[PDB]
Amino acid sequence: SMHLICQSGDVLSARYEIVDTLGEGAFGKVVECIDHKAGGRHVAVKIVKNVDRYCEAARSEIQVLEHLNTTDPNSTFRCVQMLEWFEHHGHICIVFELLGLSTYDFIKENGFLPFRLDHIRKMAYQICKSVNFLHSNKLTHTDLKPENILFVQSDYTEAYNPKIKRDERTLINPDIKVVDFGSATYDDEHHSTLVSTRHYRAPEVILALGWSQPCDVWSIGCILIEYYLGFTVFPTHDSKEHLAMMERILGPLPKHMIQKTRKRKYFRLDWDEHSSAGRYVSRACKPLKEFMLSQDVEHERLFDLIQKMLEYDPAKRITLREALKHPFFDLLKKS
Ligand SMILES: Cn1cc(-c2ccc3occ(-c4cnn(Cc5ccccc5)c4)c3n2)cn1
């Protein structure tokens, strides 16, 4: 089992000494290591489960990162740098530059207090820049979520907050990078039927209509809402209920998408508003703009961008290249 080979003090590839576990996901774990052959530099090492699905993703990710890292050697577009990879007791291990906390862990460890709007603006801009680089290179990420957006540096202050009695982290600089290219898919490759983590999954994915770069835009809009509220507006683990929540937040789905779904197993959604699930969706969900916490124009600008990212029709949906020009980002450009 992986626990036999990922302990503090273990040495991987005769050079990488484990000093901490940074976290786990379905894929395995990421550990922080000292690289004794690079002058003691700390790196991150992703230790992949020895299971075919994950091994296959890791091999794919290695090829995608080789491509992205060679194309953008300065990481101008903020995709994490892979340093090398190796095998350890049958596990694929990928070595990366050491980044800071995931945006998920940062918000979670703060009791789900939302990010400041000024930080959201900077983060959103960088996420759009980064993922647009993928889209410029005939790639779609497919698994964008706060866990896969990491802070570059550990540029925060921490203290034991008297009020809550737990420790709070406060961000100083919000710069990010994008990680996890194990689901990333080239335009000309086989597209998996099911992609994305449910809460970030676009309607064309749910409806098996075909997906491409626009499904990433949908996921980013969901991420930005989460950063702003501290929670998802789609609190569900069921596809039909997910669609009903979309309908309540965004309005009815377009006829053309309903009529294409040859898997019209969900259809007007066939949904009882008066059932337990129906009552839950009406309580939990409301039109998008009602989630705004301020009527100040910068909040309106953020919500306008989110609404465009959550456009049902993936053709009409704003592209990332267009998103970068949106008014929300003007504060970044006001020299
Ligand atoms: C999926 N993936 C992560 C990297 C990755 C790459 C470089 C990294 O420098 C630091 C981390 C780091 C910080 N928290 N975590 C926990 C975690 C995050 C995301 C998902 C699971 C665990 C990792 C890190 N991670 C490459 N693929």
In the chain, domain spans: 1-75+80-98, 76-79+99-335
Pocket-testing residue among 104, 143, 179, 180, ligand 1, by greatest number of atoms within 8 A of Cβ: 179
Give the experimental resolution in Å. 1.6
3-class DSSP state for residue 30? strand
Burial state string for 210-244 with b = 16 or more CB within 10 A and e = fewer than 16: ebebbbbbbbbbbbbbbbbeeebbbebeeebbbbb
Ligand 1 touching residue 23 (CB < 6 A)? yes
- Cα 15 to Cα 3: distance, rounded to the nearest angstrom: 19
- Cα 143 to Cα 107: distance, rounded to the nearest angstrom: 19
Binding region for ATP: 22-30, 46
Please indicate whether residue 143 is annotated as part of the active site: yes
Q: How far is CA 99 from CA 32, 69, 75, 175, 330, in A?
A: 10, 16, 13, 10, 28
**CATH of range 1-75+80-98; options 3.30.200.20, 3.40.50.970, 3.50.50.60, 3.40.1120.10:** 3.30.200.20
Q: How was this structure determined?
A: X-ray
Which one from 143, 296, 304, 330 is the annotated catalytic residue?
A: 143
**Cα 331 to ligand 1 centroid, rounded to whole Å:** 30
Pocket-testing residue among 6, 21, 30, ligand 1, by greatest number of atoms within 8 A of Cβ: 30
Ligand 1 touching residue 180 (CB < 6 A)? yes
Burial state string for 86-112 with b = 16 or more CB within 10 A and e = fewer than 16: eebeebbbbbbebbbbbbbbbbeebee
